[PDB]
From a paper:
Nitrilotriacetate monooxygenase (NTA-Mo) is an oxidoreductase and a member of the family of two-component monooxygenases which initiates the oxidation of NTA under aerobic conditions. This enzyme is comprised of two parts: component A (NTA-MoA), which has monooxygenase activity and is responsible for the oxidative conversion of NTA to iminodiacetate (IDA) and glyoxylate, and component B (NTA-MoB), a flavin reductase which consumes NADH to reduce FMN to FMNH2, which is a required cofactor in the oxidization step. The amino-acid alignment and the three-dimensional structure motif of NTA-MoB from M. thermoresistibile (MthNTA-MoB) associate it with a family of short-chain flavin reductases.
Here, we report the 1.6 Å resolution crystal structure of MthNTA-MoB, a homolog of Rv3567c from M. tuberculosis (Mtu) in a highly conserved family within Mycobacterium. MthNTA-MoB consists of 11 β-strands and five α-helices, with seven antiparallel β-sheet core regions forming a split-barrel motif capped by an α-helix. Consistent with observations from size-exclusion chromatography, the biological molecule observed within the crystal lattice is a dimer and the crystal structure contained two noncrystallographically related dimers. PISA calculated a total buried surface area of 8610 Å2 and a change in solvent free energy of −234 kJ mol−1 upon dimerization. The spatial difference between Cα atoms of MthNTA-MoB and BtPheA2 is 0.98 Å, indicating a high degree of structural conservation for two proteins with only 32% sequence similarity. In the MthNTA-MoB structure the loop region has the highest deviation from the structure of substrate-bound BtPheA2. The other region in which MthNTA-MoB deviates most from the BtPheA2 structure is in the C-terminal loop region from Lys165 to Thr182. This region adopts the same conformation in all four protomers in the asymmetric unit and is flexible and adjacent to the NADH-binding cleft. The density was sufficient to allow modelling of the long loop at the C-terminus, a region that is often absent in structures obtained using crystallo­graphic data owing to a high degree of flexibility, and may provide additional insight into its role in modulating activity via access for cofactor binding.
Author numbering:
A (entry chain A): 3 to 181
B (entry chain B): 1 to 182
Amino acid sequence: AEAIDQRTFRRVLGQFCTGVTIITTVHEGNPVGFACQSFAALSLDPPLVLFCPTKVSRSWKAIEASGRFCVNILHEKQQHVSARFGSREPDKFAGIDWRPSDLGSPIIDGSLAHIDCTVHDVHDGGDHFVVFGKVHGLSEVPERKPRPLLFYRGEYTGIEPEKNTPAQWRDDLEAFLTA
Amino acid sequence: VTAEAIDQRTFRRVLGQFCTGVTIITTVHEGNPVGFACQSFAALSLDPPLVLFCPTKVSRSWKAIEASGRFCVNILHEKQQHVSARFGSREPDKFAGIDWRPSDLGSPIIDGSLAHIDCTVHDVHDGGDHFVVFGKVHGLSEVPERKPRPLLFYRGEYTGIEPEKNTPAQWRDDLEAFLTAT
């Protein structure tokens, strides 16, 4: 009954659709990363983001040690990259083109956007941590078609661009960070 | 030394490249239903079962949620763009013309939503010009069943999925698996 309760959490929370990130660092010379969907924009002033690694994550411990990370937001053509980071295969950056950011963290070629960060604060979050990052630089790749990789009810998907609709807002007290 | 190095227009443009669902987060306070639209939501923990959301420090709804001690998260269907629009307006009664009923804890469920999650306030942290609020999950539901077509927000616009793109996914590394992985 414990395992069924956990299956229900996974299914119901899966109804909230998200993009997909790879969060990366370099620790003593080698590139390190993990796939993550528990990402959000947090604050404009100061500029902050958050992400939620598991308490058992090996990749987060490398980020904690360096104090630096880059967030790569994935394009739908990068489904293979996400699958690679999700596996137990060694040498995860093999065959994947990348370059260091201004702070030294891996930027993956072909992404929609990247965000160059330092670790700002860390909190306990049950069986996960919540990590705040301070933003030091960011950009989107020009002329790449805006088609994000999605994750919804346990499967990869993408958008139908014919559905794109302008949004108007008036309540300034509750403004989205991205409007 | 106080540093200002990030342009605000650039922040909004770049962070909009991360696509999200759309929620309405609700409570009852001083005999009235209260709610707001929010994209800063995430699944947080399995054991214990937790979620998080991030209201602005100036939020009217957060003051009501803080006082009552409880909230319900409603995940919207693509045909509910009109609900998100009303909650994003300055109308004095936002629940007018929108069908709703109380959850087991006593917070508004929006009829026609894809799913809802019934919570109590668990902890609260400072997050710059926002707060980060943790909720303890007491109930959750994805019925009555509706065709699985979520309302999305991407690059400052509403959108939706192409269901022909839906593809199964496998995850061998248990130490890093998503909370919602099958």
